[PDB]
């Protein structure tokens, strides 16, 4: 009832099971048939970097069914609100509960049992809309029918032209802000990130397409006559936001102790909340002092920010400056073409942080070999 | 190492912690049965039976189910004997030595091999006969087996006809596989390979093999 034949079949399963990733075709078809046979005899056979707070719970709930290949999160308001995962056999009904058990933000799952496949209308979405209470701006009303791995998607909306007057920031978390487009008619409009704002060509004192929906209203993508190149937009908005914010990831952040933070990082020392604490920690560290001594404020304050080696220079050589006491007080870029390079604008938006850490390292280097 | 006092012989139950999700009811099922069991002498004696619940469940990697205790002078340890006199241990050591390669050996007992649980399904029986106490132990067994099968991911049943339906008597799709009695005739351990598949599905579940040599005495 157990022979050598089954042994041979399972041996081939053994050998090619973890060569399945890139096997040859006959192996994959044989495996489809041998998972078949063994199951009745042997019973076993555009998103970006999500930091770890979510990846831990992801690693747990992916153990709930090995058909799960990814998890689908909506990033909103600096929150990862899962809605489902790409599973092959497990209906997400356990999955959102699990993700709730593992610290993943889930929505208010108010799913009307649908018998006949239908698309929702005025009430059919409105009433669920009240019942949802989405402090998160999620506008896709989708219903999962259990028995499938897809969904029914309903959403209705208008669009018009709104007259912007100015652009703002709005704190949403720790030191983090978003743009709230302010209109000549006293209304605020939302966007997703900084790059949504950029892509829009958003400026002041004109009309633009906006998609108006009842619970939320979102600044509509762009469709018009674009002659205003990207760099001009980047420069304009970087000035408009103010000189106190740099751009971290999808968001802003004020310049502050994070400079001392990164710097203490780069020199293998303890956290120093103030500057004299820093100079002390350096001074007692003969190696850190002696490895500052050989360097320049410029090379060091750019190595503490990881700009690659060179294109930094194509930037630097494109602006004029204002210095006293060997210390930057002002600066301004005058040729805007370089910003049209991708690797360039990531450095440009991230500049005021570099200026500040530069002044700081200047000061410590002055007072240390003082 | 917890204990409970029971109604009748041997009045005491010393269970390891792995067995605590079930001991609660094992007492319940026992007090209403023992009064009958002990009307006659049995083997292994009443002072045995549950000896193999003080053993852990997490260290264990396969379990071997011999449906029955020795009809003549058992010890509460399945297939065990102090002077290698009984046939089951004899043929088991034989068909193991057949694959290991050493055939000069003092004795044998399956218990100390790491990863194996030597298990009876009926925890005792009258002297000289077999299966004579199946009317008493049935749910006790059913319960022990549900507990033990979610710790160990394999099942090798000894007995071609007795473990005929146990697929339906367990509700977890464990890797249950059936074998044949070697103490039986037609030389059933001569016509079946019983091992060399153990450390194979212990392979495909990405786990360590079974150390079939340690049970030899020298």
Author numbering:
A (entry chain C): 1 to 45, 102 to 426
B (entry chain E): 1 to 218
Can you quote the paper on this entry?
The MPXV DNA polymerase holoenzyme, consisting of F8, A22, and E4, is vital for replicating the viral genome and represents a crucial target for the development of antiviral drugs. Similar to vaccinia virus (VACV), another well-studied member of Poxviridae, the DNA polymerase holoenzyme of MPXV encoded by the viral genome contains three proteins: the uracil-DNA glycosylase E4, the processivity factor A22, and the DNA polymerase F8 belonging to the B-family polymerases, which correspond to D4, A20, and E9 in VACV, respectively. A22 works as a bridge for connecting F8 and E4, among which E4 is crucial for the association of viral DNA templates with enzymes to process efficiently. Here, we found the two different states of DNA replication holoenzyme from MPXV, which could be induced by the dsDNA to transition an inactive hexameric form into a more active trimeric form.
A 3D reconstruction was obtained at a resolution of 3.5 Å from 391,085 selected particles, revealing the dimer of heterotrimers’ architecture. Unexpectedly, unlike any other previously reported B-family polymerase, the holoenzyme complex is assembled as a dimer of heterotrimers. For clarity, two protomers are referred to as protomer A: F8/A22/E4 and protomer B: F8′/A22′/E4′. The overall architecture exhibits a central symmetry, creating an extra interface: the Neck domain of A22 and the thumb domain of F8′. Structural analysis illustrated that in the hexameric form of the DNA polymerase holoenzyme from MPXV, the DNA polymerase F8 directly interacts with the uracil-DNA glycosylase E4, in contrast to the previous low-resolution models from VACV, which assumed that the complex is elongated in shape and the DNA polymerase and uracil-DNA glycosylase are separated. The structure of the F8 polymerase showed an open conformation, with 927 of its 1006 side chains assigned, including the N-terminal, exonuclease, palm, fingers, thumb domains, and five “poxvirus-specific” inserts (insert 0 to insert 4). The interface between F8 and C-terminal domain of A22 is mainly mediated by the short helices of poxvirus-specific insert 3 region that inserts into the hydrophobic pocket of A22. In addition, the interface between F8 and E4 is mainly mediated by the hydrophobic interactions involved in Val178, Phe179, and Leu278 of F8 and Val33, Trp36, Ile135, and Tyr136 of E4. To be noticed, when aligning F8 with yeast DNA polymerase δ, the thumb domain of F8 is engaged by the Neck domain of A22′ and also shows a clash between A22′ and substrate dsDNA, suggesting an inhibitory effect of A22 on the elongation of DNA polymerase in this structure (right). Together, these findings suggest that the hexameric form of DNA polymerase holoenzyme from MPXV might represent as an inactive conformation.
